[PDB]
Ligand binder design. Structure first.
Ligand SMILES: O=C(NC/C=C/[C@H]1O[C@@H](n2ccc(=O)cc2)[C@H](O)[C@@H]1O)c1cc([N+](=O)[O-])cc(O)c1O
Ligand SMILES: [Mg+2]
Length: 213
């Protein structure tokens, strides 16, 4: 029994089926109170929401599904006919994400791709009927942000105005990617400061009074 299955089970037990907001709130409660997990969380999630609403993307690529928290967050804001594709190398995470989307009622909008991003990116156009991407959410292994961005470009998946949105650029950090994009005339960058997810960390003092030998 994994932490990820425990999160899904908590959602099935407590959230309202077909209600994406309820699903996000159930995840946030469980991870705030019971077990830390690497979901983007509601603080950064609000920022994501504002960006998605600004750009109204028709085709979004997510790198890194995990439990589906960000896939639920994004897909609930997509217009009719818009699509999210999400890449997940861990088959256990891919299954959880699909059940989460199902529970939320968002399964029609989202396609899960099982595999490593660097292996899947070159197959997008032919296998998933993609021309260029409107938005890319990066939230997978931090050392893959830069090489995958380069591969996206190589494969002709970026157009003028494609919006890349990257989590964790301060903590744990993505320093090669951040330096690259900030220094490149091919990208115009903006930083949105927020807070790392679920950081009310419990600790305590133990008093132990010696009673004699
Ligand atoms: O390490 C972090 N994220 C790595 C994410 C990894 C996810 O991306 C998938 N994937 C999908 C496709 C691939 O090709 C590779 C991996 C993995 O199978 C996992 O589901 C992280 C860590 C902290 N932290 O505070 O420690 C906070 C965060 O917000 C984080 O995102
Ligand atoms: Mg993250």
């Amino acid at each position: 029994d994994t932490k990820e299955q425990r999160i899904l089970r908590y959602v099935q037990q407590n959230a309202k089926p077909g209600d994406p907001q309820s699903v996000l709130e159930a995840i946030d409660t469980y991870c705030t109170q019971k077990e830390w997990a690497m979901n983007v969380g509601d603080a950064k999630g609000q920022i994501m929401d504002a960006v998605i609403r600004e750009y109204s993307p028709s085709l979004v690529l997510e790198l890194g599904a995990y439990c589906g928290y960000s896939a639920v967050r994004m897909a609930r804001l997509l217009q009719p006919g818009a699509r999210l594709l999400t890449m997940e190398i861990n088959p256990d995470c891919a299954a959880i994400t699909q059940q989460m989307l199902n529970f939320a009622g968002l399964q029609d909008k989202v396609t899960i791709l099982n595999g490593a991003s660097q292996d899947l990116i070159p197959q997008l156009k032919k296998k998933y009927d993609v021309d260029t991407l409107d938005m890319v959410f990066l939230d997978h292994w931090k050392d893959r942000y830069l090489p995958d961005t380069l591969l996206l470009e190589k494969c002709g998946l970026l157009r003028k105005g494609t919006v890349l949105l990257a989590d964790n650029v301060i903590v744990p950090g993505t320093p090669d990617f951040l330096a690259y994009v900030r220094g490149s005339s091919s990208f115009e960058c903006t930083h949105y400061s927020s807070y790392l997810e679920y950081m009310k960390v419990v600790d305590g003092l133990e008093k132990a009074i010696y009673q004699g030998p």
